[PDB]
Design goal:
part of a larger assembly, 9 chains, A: mainly alpha, Enzyme I, Chain A, domain 2, Topoisomerase I, Chain A, domain 4, three-stranded antiparallel sheet, two-stranded antiparallel sheet, 5 strands, flat, C: 6 helices, extended, RNA-binding, DNA-directed RNA polymerase activity (chain F), transcription (chain F), DNA-directed RNA polymerase subunit alpha (chain F)
RNA sequence: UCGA
């Protein structure tokens, strides 16, 4: 009874910016843990690996008001520095939505033109009929079929041609889009025009950035809320799972190794600072060639590529060390080592390669502890 | 003179204290510098 | 076990944590087989604290020595010598992993080695003198207990090794389904298990103690630590693994320790795991459990806590421990004996009275 | 809160009074004064 | 002077302020934070905090 | 045995075609157990009549469109799919729709044979361009669920026959979800929110009652084995 | 008109409350001081303007008053 | 886990509704897929596949000539009963070729049906919805610590 | 529509488990219907489990009984595997007394009137010449899983030892569907289910308990 | 001395 509509402030230390503190509405929950909204994690920079958070309870009416208006979570969806949306679908929601919007060639139920005695037959009457066709094994979400839409809004330019008098409040129309792109456009508000694109975290940032400017804040809060439900729902169905089989090794490395190692072995005849640089500059190309050949080898449906290619998480350089070769690793000083890491984490690293790998790995981890200390000292001088 | 409030997307309110906001805007990413 | 083999540079006659530069923290090429480069803290103590290697041992002067297999004229020898730093650089060290023929020798024409740099080099069997006794010479006990260690980055490997010492004894500890062979040796050397020092036959078996009858006629007994509170609050309970009429051997395990199964280190459970995102409930490192683990106690652990109070002579009188607490409802003291302490086996909750005591006051006013 | 009334108006943090007394121990004459007239006393001394 | 005292080189800041017989107008917000006052920003501006609220006579008639 | 308390069912109406239903409380996690079975029952388990094929006069080998009408063959195909008709025949019944000259065709223009009825006379089938004629034969048969276009070679042999994807069950759309309500000291008891959008054939209230009737009778074969003890009402 | 009937603490929306006052800070003292009055009524003295809930925080009552243009304020 | 993977418990589902194999045997822990590739610790997947290999018994056909995958193969390890314990020393371990060949093995789940393919993925059934998941997922036995 | 009243025919594999099949069913109905019974099986089938135990020598669970190899905690972890069936709603207490050397099994308990133990081979404890074990256990009626009910919330005294109570006859339940037929020809979805009990009840009694459970639940 |  007293908890009702009584806001509380959540804090995750360290607090770098003002979004490190946000107001929420409490929901009595069992257990001793705290349930945090997955979208606000980017603001708190809060990992679920065991982070601890603090709660404060405002008392006076002025304090409660400042928590509801100023510090409410739904009120601040944008980073007050760059302006980009800070709370947006990320990680599972990215790959979850990136999976829906994609259109697969020759999927089940794909629409084809009418030929001779066969009518079109690929189109569907209504979106509700597409669900009936989906539940039964006929329709696929990634199919190329086209449907007739009533409530949804068509793109602006295409809207004016279909309708000269106005928009489509209750009026029907048709376009060719994947069902995943139709269901995705159902989450967005009705007034927003159709997208018909495959969702990338960069594109999804362009759309959310467009809603924050054009529409009210509440509509953006509910739209982002509806996006995380679909992002999580289709993240399980995404078919994205890691196994030793999905990760694979490109063959071209051994040739580049044969080429480089042997053509660099011919360089060993001449053998000083440029000699190692000649091997480093040579070995620098071997890593690029393996990664380039690796990108060409991997199919698109494989999960590891779908990740980091949709912007959810990861980078190509990290995948360059996983398969292929991790490449040269720096020594205690800033000097590179000519001898590379020819092995990959998939193939396993030799005893010796591991010893020289910790040289750079620990030095970078010690840098992390130092940079956070100097940045905190710099920030206090800026504030004061 | 300041400009549009980056979080609001609108003009800056009469109460906004932008010195602390700017200090945090510059300091927070400082962990990514080399 | 890992605590006892720890090596830290800080202390009296040593550098302070803030005073220590970044040069010491970086692993030196002389740490091979002596100090484990992977295992160290992730806090302010990185690089200062380390774990002594597996096969290494200390000199009378204090310089760490590492074992090596001497090889002369391209043929591995049964001889083993313990080399230490300066002496290791005067020789070339063959790679532990190398081709070996049946009779024994350098099978390949070109072999790996590490010179006085230390710098890796590809040489021939002519110039090789010393060879590693085996891989993992460098990594410590905690690091050597990680299966597929070569497939993980040093960062996460450091976290995995550190979190292994952060585990907790479970009610029934089961050995790892898949794991390196280090769990066997490391378990019996930790001292928290029971070992038989004489070959013979067990005379009696009980939860309190076990008795062995040696073949030489002597009778030895071993008392089992039962639900003892660890220094950090965990349970040290031991269980006998032997049958009454069984026969043991010198060095054979008898009773398992807090975390052990049949003589191996058991730090956790083997669970059936499906790797997929599940409707947002496992998001960004979060994990979801099957309710079977709660019903079957597989993840259940016991925690003991120690509370202490004293009755001291005060300036105004003497402190008395009794059931006579001045202001209370008689209902709240029902669990206390006449002396005023709590009754063994009784339950409790936050706010209950474990021990009643009293102190004089004056003037009351 | 127990009486259901409104939260009253805050006072002066106690640590600030301690700060003034600490400064007075260093032999630094410190005074909190009103805009009009002269200084005022937080307590017996300020 | 107490804003610089709470920042850095407290010893040097104090001796200089005491020699010059400095006076702090308690203008900035860091001062109001230390003394427990309302910071002169956000809702603490001299205008917002003095707002008066009353129900419109037209709306009060409904009651 | 078993004893339970206070399962309820309420009705909130969004419109004539769709309404909301709630059940509170459900013992965890029965909300998710029977939720998807209700959705599956409402969609594919309710009998209804629809059109399994149509034949427009004058169109045989044409890829698309038609002379005398602004509607392409495809638009009329999905325009005719939205025809809500309930028949008592249980066997295929042939209907006929005819018109000519300038005008616009509606559902009331077709003459329904005795035993079948169209519930949406105001629906728009097509528009006839000036000096044009349109004649179409329809095949209406009962069924359940959603059966796609069928090639039986009887439709394939006939030069004109056009089979259409059949929407049989009158229930168009159904979704669900569960939440947690505290009935007593016991926390997180399940509630079931189920949304159902149907067409004028039957109402959502009658569709729910029919769906529940087929389910209770569907699990009746398992209950007949013993009838030892079950969860109380 | 895209609300989807917001539920709690977000009702009324801030945007419709922002058109009733200068800035978000003016809105705070606006609703806050009114919440002070409503709680004083149950012990300035001028009732609730809108039909209250069963047990409603005085601040939530004041926010619904501002929503319907039922209050006036003058800045200092 | 032992590889540096860590995380709290976001929720515990009842045994009734949980992804389970065709066995009817529910899984235990559900690990987020997105965390595996980024953190650069892939050994957990290896011990997860090998964990399932050692859980169920496995028998190598070997025929007359032996698979070449076993040229440098483990000695007299070809056979092994169900719930067998295996040891993979750090730098003398079970290599990639052996893991793939080890996946092919005996999988008699009360009957003749095998619950894991040579790729280490199985088709899970959602206990909450009642329908199978659209794609094959990686399942196995890992070792986790409290 | 096609008229075929779906009929269910039971099968048997072992005594603990028996298969069941229902035909015919509309396409797509096998998965959700088989799961609606599976979840109800794994949940609401009553028990037939033990609530608390009591031992004369021990006042709590963390002490060892003299002359036995196990401890009270390990003994309780062994007692969790008990499969009991009771016809009485009100609670009742069994009794177990074993002196001298030997191995105490699940059959050594003397059940009261109307209750039985379905796995006498279960291992409890092993004692020696000095070992003596006297323990009484409370068998109760319920369903699903309930944790140990602490005596502080109950009216019990210090001696009684609460234990986690698991009431469920069912062990492992799965299913499968064969739509078969062809793309055309009115393919009928039929499900073949696999139900296994612990011997507390037969697979028919469980599927009837689950079948009759949702029969009363469905309403409109 | 460890956890993020």
């Amino acid at each position: 009874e007293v908890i009702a509509e009584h806001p509380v402030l959540l804090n995750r230390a360290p607090t770098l910016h003002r979004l490190g503190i946000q107001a929420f509405e409490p929901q009595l929950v069992e257990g001793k843990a705290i349930q945090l909204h997955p979208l606000v994690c980017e603001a708190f920079n809060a990992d679920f690996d065991g982070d601890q958070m603090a709660v404060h309870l405002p008392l006076s009416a002025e304090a409660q008001a400042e928590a509801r208006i100023l510090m409410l979570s739904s009120n601040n969806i944008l980073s007050p520095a760059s302006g980009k949306p800070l709370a947006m679908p990320r990680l599972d929601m990215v790959t979850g939505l990136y999976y829906l919007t994609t259109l697969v060639e020759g999927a089940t139920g794909e629409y084809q033109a009418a030929t001779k005695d066969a009518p079109e037959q690929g189109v569907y009457s209504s979106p509700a009929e597409a669900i009936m066709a989906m539940d039964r094994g006929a329709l696929s979400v990634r199919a190329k079929i086209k449907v007739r839409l009533t409530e949804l809004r068509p793109p602006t330019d295409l809207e004016a041609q279909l309708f000269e008098n106005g928009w489509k409040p209750g009026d029907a129309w048709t376009e060719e889009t994947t069902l995943g792109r139709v269901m995705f456009n159902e989450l967005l508000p009705k007034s927003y025009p159709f997208v018909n694109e495959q969702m990338h975290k960069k594109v999804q940032a362009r759309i959310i950035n467009d809603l924050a400017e054009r529409f009210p804040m509440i509509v953006v809060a509910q739209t982002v809320d509806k996006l995380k439900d679909a992002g999580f729902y289709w993240a399980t169905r995404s078919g994205v799972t890691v196994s030793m089989a999905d990760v694979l090794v490109p063959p071209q490395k051994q040739e580049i190794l044969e080429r480089h190692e042997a053509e660099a072995d011919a360089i060993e005849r001449k053998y000083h600072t440029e000699r190692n640089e000649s091997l480093v500059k040579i070995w620098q190309d071997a890593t690029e060639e393996v990664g380039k050949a690796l990108e060409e080898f991997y199919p698109a449906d494989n999960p590891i590529i779908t990740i980091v290619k949709s912007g959810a998480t990861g980078n190509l350089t990290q995948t360059r060390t996983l398969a292929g070769m991790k490449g040269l690793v720096t020594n205690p000083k800033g000097e590179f080592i000519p001898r590379p890491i020819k092995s990959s984490f998939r193939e396993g690293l030799t005893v010796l390669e591991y010893f020289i790998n910790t040289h750079g790995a620990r030095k970078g981890l010690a840098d992390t502890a130092l940079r956070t200390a100097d940045s905190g000292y710099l920030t206090r001088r800026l504030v004061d | 003179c300041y400009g549009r409030s980056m979080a609001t997307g609108k003009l800056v309110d009469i109460g906004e204290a932008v010195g602390i906001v700017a200090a945090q805007s510059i300091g927070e990413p400082g962990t990514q510098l080399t | 076990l890992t605590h006892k083999r720890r090596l830290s540079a800080l202390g009296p006659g040593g550098l302070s944590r803030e005073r220590a530069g970044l040069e010491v923290r970086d692993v030196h090429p002389s740490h091979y087989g002596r100090m484990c480069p992977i295992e160290t803290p992730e806090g302010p103590n990185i690089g200062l604290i380390g774990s002594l290697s597996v096969y290494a041992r200390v000199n009378p002067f204090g310089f760490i020595e590492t074992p090596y297999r001497k090889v002369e004229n391209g043929v591995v020898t049964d001889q083993i010598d313990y080399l230490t730093a300066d002496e290791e650089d005067r020789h070339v060290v063959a790679q532990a992993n190398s081709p070996t023929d049946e009779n024994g020798r350098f099978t390949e024409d070109r072999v790996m080695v590490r010179k006085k740099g230390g710098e890796v080099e590809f040489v021939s069997a002519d110039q090789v003198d010393y060879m590693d006794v085996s891989p993992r010479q460098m990594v410590s006990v905690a690091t050597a207990m990680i299966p597929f260690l070569e497939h993980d980055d040093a960062n996460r490997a450091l976290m995995g090794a550190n979190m292994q010492r952060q585990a907790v004894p479970l009610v029934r500890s089961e050995a790892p389904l898949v794991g390196t062979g280090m769990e066997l040796r490391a378990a019996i050397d930790a001292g928290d298990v029971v070992v038989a020092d004489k070959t013979g036959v067990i005379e009696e078996v009980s939860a309190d103690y076990i008795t062995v009858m040696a073949d030489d006629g002597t009778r030895q007994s071993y008392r089992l630590r039962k639900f003892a509170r660890s220094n950090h609050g965990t349970c040290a309970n031991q269980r006998p693994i032997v049958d009454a009429g069984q026969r043991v051997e010198a060095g054979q395990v008898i009773a398992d320790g807090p975390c052990t199964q049949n003589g191996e280190m058991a730090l956790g459970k083997n669970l059936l795991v499906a790797i997929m995102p599940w409707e947002g409930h496992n998001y960004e490192d979060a994990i979801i459990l099957s309710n079977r683990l709660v019903e079957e106690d597989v993840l259940t652990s016991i925690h003991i806590e120690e509370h202490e109070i004293d009755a001291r002579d005060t300036k105004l009188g003497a402190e008395e421990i009794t059931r006579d607490i001045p202001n209370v409802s008689d209902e709240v003291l029902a669990d206390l004996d006449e002396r005023g302490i709590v009754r063994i086996g009784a339950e409790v909750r936050d706010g209950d009275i474990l021990v009643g005591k009293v102190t004089p006051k004056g003037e009351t006013e | 809160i127990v009486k259901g009334e409104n939260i009253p108006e805050p006072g002066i943090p106690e640590s600030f009074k301690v700060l003034l007394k600490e400064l007075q121990s260093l032999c630094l004459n410190v005074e909190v004064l009103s805009s009009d007239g002269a200084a005022i006393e937080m307590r017996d001394g300020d | 002077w107490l804003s610089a005292a709470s920042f850095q080189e407290t010893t040097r800041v104090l001796t200089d302020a005491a020699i010059n017989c400095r006076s702090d107008k308690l203008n900035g917000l860091k001062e109001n934070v230390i003394i427990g006052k309302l910071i002169p920003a956000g809702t603490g501006i001299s205008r917002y905090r003095n707002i008066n609220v009353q129900p419109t006579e037209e709306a009060r008639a409904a009651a | 045995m078993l004893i339970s308390q206070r399962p309820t069912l309420s009705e909130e109406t969004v419109a004539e075609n769709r309404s909301r239903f709630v059940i509170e409380p459900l013992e965890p996690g029965f909300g998710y157990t029977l939720g998807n079975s209700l959705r599956r029952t409402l969609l594919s388990s309710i009998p209804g009549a629809a059109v399994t094929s149509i034949r427009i006069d004058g169109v045989l080998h044409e890829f698309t469109t038609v002379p005398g009408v602004k509607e392409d063959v495809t638009d009329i195909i999905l325009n005719l799919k939205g025809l809500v008709v309930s028949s008592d025949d249980d066997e295929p019944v042939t209907m006929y729709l005819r018109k000519q000259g300038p005008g616009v065709v509606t559902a009331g223009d077709i003459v329904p044979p005795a035993g079948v009825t169209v519930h949406n006379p105001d629906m728009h089938i097509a528009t006839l361009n000036d000096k044009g004629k349109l004649e179409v034969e329809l095949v209406v048969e009962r069924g359940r669920g959603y059966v796609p276009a069928v090639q039986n070679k009887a439709s394939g042999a006939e030069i004109g026959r056009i089979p259409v994807d059949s929407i049989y069950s009158p229930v168009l759309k159904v979704t669900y979800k569960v939440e947690a309500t505290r009935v007593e000291q016991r926390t997180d008891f399940d509630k079931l929110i189920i949304d159902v959008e149907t067409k004028n054939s039957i109402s959502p209230r009658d569709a729910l009652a029919s769906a529940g009737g087929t389910l209770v009778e569907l699990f009746g074969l398992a209950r007949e084995l013993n009838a030892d003890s079950e969860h109380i009402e | 008109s895209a609300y989807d009937t917001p539920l709690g603490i977000t009702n009324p929306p801030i945007d419709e409350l922002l058109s009733r006052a200068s800035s978000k800070y003016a809105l705070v003292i606006y609703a806050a001081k009114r919440a002070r009055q409503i709680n004083d009524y149950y012990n300035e003295y001028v009732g609730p303007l809108v039909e209250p809930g069963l047990q409603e925080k005085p601040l939530s009552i004041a926010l619904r008053e501002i929503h319907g243009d039922l209050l006036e304020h003058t800045e200092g | 886990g032992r590889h540096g993977n860590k995380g709290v418990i976001g929720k515990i589902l009842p045994v009734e509704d949980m992804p389970f194999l065709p066995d009817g045997t529910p899984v235990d822990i559900i690990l987020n897929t997105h965390g595996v590739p980024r953190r650069m610790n892939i050994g957990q997947i290896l011990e997860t596949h090998l964990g399932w290999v050692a859980k169920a018994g496995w028998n190598i056909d070997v025929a007359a000539g032996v698979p070449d995958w076993a040229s440098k193969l483990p000695e007299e390890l070809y056979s092994a009963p169900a719930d067998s314990t295996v040891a993979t020393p750090v730098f003398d371990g079970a290599q990639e070729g052996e893991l793939a060949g080890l996946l092919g093995s005996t999988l008699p789940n009360r009957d003749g049906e095998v619950m894991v393919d040579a790729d280490g993925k199985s088709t899970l059934f959602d206990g909450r919805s009642g329908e199978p998941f659209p794609y094959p997922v990686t399942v196995g036995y890992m070792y986790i610590l409290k």
